[PDB]
């Protein structure tokens, strides 16, 4: 509450004083343009005409010529003329080729797709840690394998055990696995890929092995990272069937996935975080710990974890401080946690028709019925006999 | 409560700007690569671009008439000749062929197939590894002493029993056996090449492309002298048919096709060792696992009680252990698995010790990375 | 007069032989972006002046 306007405050006044800084500091007037810059500029204009039509660097032959692969079916045996130095350029680049004849004027691609960018999801982790409810002993299971290296490497090193690779997060819906996985995301700092595994079902051809070598060059790039192979069990053990197409694809790429985890040894430097539902009654297709190491069952909530987690949200409540807190998490059986979120959104739609602006000292004992009720019928647990 | 909602609101316009300023920032400041002393070679390439060599169209002979007939790749056909003088001797039947836009006549000859170059890339020599500190004692790391080395080293006796040199062992075992990690061992002692195949990563089409692939990597192969080709993972592609399926599909049966050939009769070799990774021999077309392709199979069995007390102590010597720990009571508890599983017992006992605030792994930790694993597999 | 202008007008623009269609995959500092002109393959263009 309070703890958040003092940062308001400062945060407010770093942005003001930034782009005030920032017109002069970017030039507006400064316009470097003495002869370091100014010879880069007028070789640059003069050599490129434009359109630049792209191409791929397949040999370099020691005599400054290179064969490429342009777009046209016709490849075109090529002068490296002016710019990128020849060592620099190693076969595999994708390369900057002059339309009026097609030589060499430069690098700036390195293999630029916009599938990279796509994959590439940084951005700000809705999550920090212990905002969620779930429980210390869950979360520090997975922080053990995954931010314990990175912070203290000394222990690591010292016992000569090597960093552990990979996860698995399985659950229980409801365990706020994803919440999870955005809590570790936002304390590593780590460049935080994420890609859902449906992309690589498709019926085109051989685009899901393409797609599978992609992941592995992204991380190693960007390292150190954390990849979010979403539901994996796409890819793998879960089906889109064989009768529409898929007698070809989904075997190529449950292989060559397989194939890149292994690969010839473990990175150790890519850490992965693999959701799925559960692999106890789905066949397992994650291959054997130690290129998965330590897998995370998260505990279907107990009595105890979901008095932390309903903490948080009477907070905001009025009149539920007569209310006795405990004995509406005790009558309910162990339940999801996701239970307790949706008695929380139900509680105040109910007050509203009651019409009681935040809710009733009544409307809360009112709740869990109608909650419990709903929940229990969509799933039906074992009845005892 | 109200005068404080405000400061939220005016907080959210300010951050939003600031990222839109980046652009900018960045400015409109154009530098490209070639530093020092290569901006001044661009001078002398100004001239050289207004002159006229580069490019060359790309095509190939098809057919040397006694001229040439040329193929270029857009598909269309020309009779051509000799630019400034070309030999007849050089231009051959699949010989890529420099020829000028429109004038359409021969430079140079330019070896043939632009495919090769591509697939280099994929192509890995010969690994290291030391065989000492290859896990376990197991009797397939015997055989495979006979089938890869013995051949190269002393082909003599092969002569003088008049028995054939092995050539080919078929792995297979479990993921976690060690199949990947006891062919680079015995790629780097016995001395000879290496060559890396990946059959997974064929996916270049076009009803019989990965059939093309295949045939020149397999013929690079014979050129090489003493070397391996370890084609890794032929589960599926040039592994299993798909012609099963209720459409189906046979660009795979291409690729299968091709390989089978060029290992069934007559073809010379130059002492090419085909080693094959599958997972399972399941998979794999019976065609393939019968004999006349592959000489042997070999089904890797599980490490001994001796080789599974030999692979924890090499993961115990990169370990800090207690003193007078017992490694073999460990792994007595320990099941009949994988060198796998025994790695990641030693990576979660590790753990427990650094969570539980020592740096030195005690026998009691080991304990519990056991009962871990156990539970894990079987619960599945 | 307008009139006779605008029959005239609508002659003139007609006439441009191609006009395509890309989408901006990056931006870079060189006054180009990479563009993956959606018919053909790729482009790296310089911007026009407008925009
Ligand atoms: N002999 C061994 N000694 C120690 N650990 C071993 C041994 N063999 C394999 N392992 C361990 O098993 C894991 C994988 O080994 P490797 O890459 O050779 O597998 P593979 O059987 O070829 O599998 P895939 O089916 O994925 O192709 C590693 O963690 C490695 O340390
Ligand atoms: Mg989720
Ligand atoms: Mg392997």
Redesign the pocket.
Known sequence: TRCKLKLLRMERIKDHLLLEEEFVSNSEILKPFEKKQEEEKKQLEEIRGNPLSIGTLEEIIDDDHAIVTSPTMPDYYVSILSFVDKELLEPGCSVLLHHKTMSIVGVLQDDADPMVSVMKMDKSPTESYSDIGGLESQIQEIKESVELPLTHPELYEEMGIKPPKGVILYGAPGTGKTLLAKAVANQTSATFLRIVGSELIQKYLGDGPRLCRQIFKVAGENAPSIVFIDEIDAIGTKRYDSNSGGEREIQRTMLEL??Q??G???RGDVKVIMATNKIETLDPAL?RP??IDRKILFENPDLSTKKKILGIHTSKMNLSEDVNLETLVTTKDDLSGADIQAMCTEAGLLALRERRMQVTAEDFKQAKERVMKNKVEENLEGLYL | AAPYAAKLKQTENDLKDIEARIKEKAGVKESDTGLAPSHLWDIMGDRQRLGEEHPLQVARCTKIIKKYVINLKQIAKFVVGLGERVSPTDIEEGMRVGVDRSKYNIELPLPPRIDPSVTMMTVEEKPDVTYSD???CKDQIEKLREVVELPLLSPERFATLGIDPPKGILLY?????????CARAVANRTDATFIRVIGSELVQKYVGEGARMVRELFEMARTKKACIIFF??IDAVGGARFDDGAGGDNEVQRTMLELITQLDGFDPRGNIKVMF?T?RPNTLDPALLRPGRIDRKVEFSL?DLEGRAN?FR??SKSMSVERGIRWELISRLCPNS???E??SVCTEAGMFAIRARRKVATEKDFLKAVDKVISGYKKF | NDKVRFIKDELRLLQEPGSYVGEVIKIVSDKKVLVKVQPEGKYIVDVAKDI
């Open positions: 397989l194939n985890l292994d010839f040894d473990d291959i130690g290129r | 290859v896990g376990g075992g479990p993921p976690g056996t060690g199949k990947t990690l890794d993972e990774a997972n490490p692979i090499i993961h994988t060198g796998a025994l790695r």
